[PDB]
Amino acid sequence: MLMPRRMKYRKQQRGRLKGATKGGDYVAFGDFGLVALEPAWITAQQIEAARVAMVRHFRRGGKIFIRIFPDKPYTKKPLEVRMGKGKGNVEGYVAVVKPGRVMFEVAGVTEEQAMEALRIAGHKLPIKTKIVRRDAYDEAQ
Amino acid sequence: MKEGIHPKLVPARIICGCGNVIETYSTKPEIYVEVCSKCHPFYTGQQRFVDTEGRVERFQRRYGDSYRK
């Protein structure tokens, strides 16, 4: 999993999600990255899920980079309880993701091989995705 | 100075062990030390005195090599 080992407050507000991403819009370490196309709350259990996927795809090899880190606490009321009497309890953590953000990028492996281990990676993901190539544009910022 | 708390340092002599009348301005009218600067196993050369050895190791104890070599 991926808890932030420590934190300033425990329960976090919910928040909107208006518009286009803030940063993380260019490859930076790998040579191929995975790109978000629609807003989301990606979960500690998904990030992990997608990661493990590729690692088991090119077993012994590559270097997986992971650009979004689940810091926000997903909160939720128990079952058979009604509205109010406290705010929900924490179960799991998430990372806010807008469209354009890179989430994974792998470095150093056969072009075919990265193009799969990032393809499979997307299916573990709750959203639409596009794989991308490191770029003159990317090295241009 | 802020008087009324300080030991009045008159002129005074520190008459030492061997020579050296370390004439000074002392807080006592006459104090007496027995060891001085000039004489010291450090100030003046390495200085011999007693310090020559203790258990001389080893051939330097002499008369070694009694057989044929």
Binding site: - | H6, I14, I22, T27, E34, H40, Y43
Partner: protein, 181 residues
């Protein structure tokens, strides 16, 4: 301001060897003493008994001045400190009182220690000063024996307008410092 033979030794002997050494241009930039802070940080009369100043009277007989106390910065469980207890003493020696103290330590007191073997030379500051310490208190016979009690010592810095540790040594060595190395 007083006829002391070390004041005169610094001038009529120590001043020149330094100008011939590090080849100074101007006269003030030549290395020169400033103070001798003597810290008798006892830490043993905190909420402990009176008698603290029973050294700060012999401390006066050494240094000619009256020592003024130092208090507890902050409370510590492991030392028994509450923010305010007195732990030690400190006298700052400026002007001729400073000199005449060294004109007794450097050539009478330093040899009055048993198993004495010069001075530690690594202990120079970095911007031109030097310090160490001492344990035995009747190391100057101004403090005579039948003023007998528990023996305690002092931390001693000496402060100079030396600009590096290098030239600094040359001063303190030239004014009679036996160096162990």
């Amino acid at each position: 301001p007083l006829d002391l033979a070390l004041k005169r030794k610094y001038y009529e002997e120590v001043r020149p060897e330094l100008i011939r050494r590090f080849g100074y241009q101007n006269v003030w930039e030549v290395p020169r003493l400033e103070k001798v802070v003597i810290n008798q940080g006892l830490g043993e009369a905190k909420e402990d008994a009176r008698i603290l100043e029973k050294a700060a009277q012999e401390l006066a007989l050494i240094t000619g001045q009256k020592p003024a106390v130092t208090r507890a910065k902050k409370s510590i469980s492991n030392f028994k400190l509450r923010k305010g207890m007195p732990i030690g003493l400190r006298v700052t020696l400026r002007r001729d009182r400073m000199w005449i103290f060294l004109e007794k330590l450097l050539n009478v007191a330093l040899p009055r220690i048993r198993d004495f073997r010069g001075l530690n030379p690594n202990s120079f500051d970095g911007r031109g000063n030097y310090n160490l310490g001492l344990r035995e208190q009747l190391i100057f016979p101004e403090i005579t024996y039948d003023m007998v009690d528990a023996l305690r010592g002092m931390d001693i810095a000496v402060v100079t307008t030396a600009e590096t540790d290098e030239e600094a040594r040359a001063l303190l060595e030239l004014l009679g410092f036996p160096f162990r190395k």
